[PDB]
């Protein structure tokens, strides 16, 4: 068979292509994954840092 004949990709291609359909739907999911990861990495750093503050028995003698 000729190499100029491309095989069948019809079962995975879109209805019509319409470039802002797979673009808008993928940029929302990457943006939502980066928003939840920055909020979770912020709560993790502040959890370890607040362990080095004064304990409950130290500020009871204040």
């Amino acid at each position: 068979k000729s190499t100029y004949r491309t095989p069948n990709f019809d079962d995975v291609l879109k209805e019509n292509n319409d470039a802002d359909k797979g673009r808008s739907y993928a940029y929302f999911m990457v943006g939502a994954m980066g928003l939840l990861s920055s909020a979770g990495a912020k709560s993790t750093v502040e959890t370890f840092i607040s362990s080095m503050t004064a304990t409950a028995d130290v500020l009871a003698m204040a």
Binding site: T47, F48, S50, S51, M52, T53, A56
Partner: protein
């Protein structure tokens, strides 16, 4: 060439986690070695922050672990992540070794 290939320190990062050629057909059993590096980071970080409140004398050792659980802010989170993180470190290591038994990873040239 690119700066990630010519710099002395960035070339080690590029050659290991960016441009490293991988076989196309490896499955999810090949993801256990990456989890073991995350387990070792969790154990070192949670243990250093707990070691600022620990006393190792024979009459002070048990009561300083109770002091971490009650008085230190988020100290129960530090201990439970450390005690349960050691059991998760051994479960992933058993699965990592059994993958090498099944797929013949011990053989030459490895």
């Amino acid at each position: 060439m690119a700066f990630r290939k010519s710099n002395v320190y960035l070339s080690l990062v590029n050659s290991y986690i960016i441009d490293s050629p991988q076989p196309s057909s490896i499955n999810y059993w090949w993801n256990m070695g990456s989890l073991l590096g995350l387990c070792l980071v969790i154990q070192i970080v949670t243990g250093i922050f707990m070691a600022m409140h620990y006393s190792s004398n024979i009459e002070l050792a048990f009561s300083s672990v109770e002091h971490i659980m009650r008085d230190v802010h988020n100290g129960y989170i530090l201990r439970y992540l450390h005690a349960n993180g050691a059991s998760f470190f051994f479960m992933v290591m058993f699965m990592h070794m059994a993958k090498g038994l099944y797929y013949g990873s011990y053989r030459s040239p490895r």
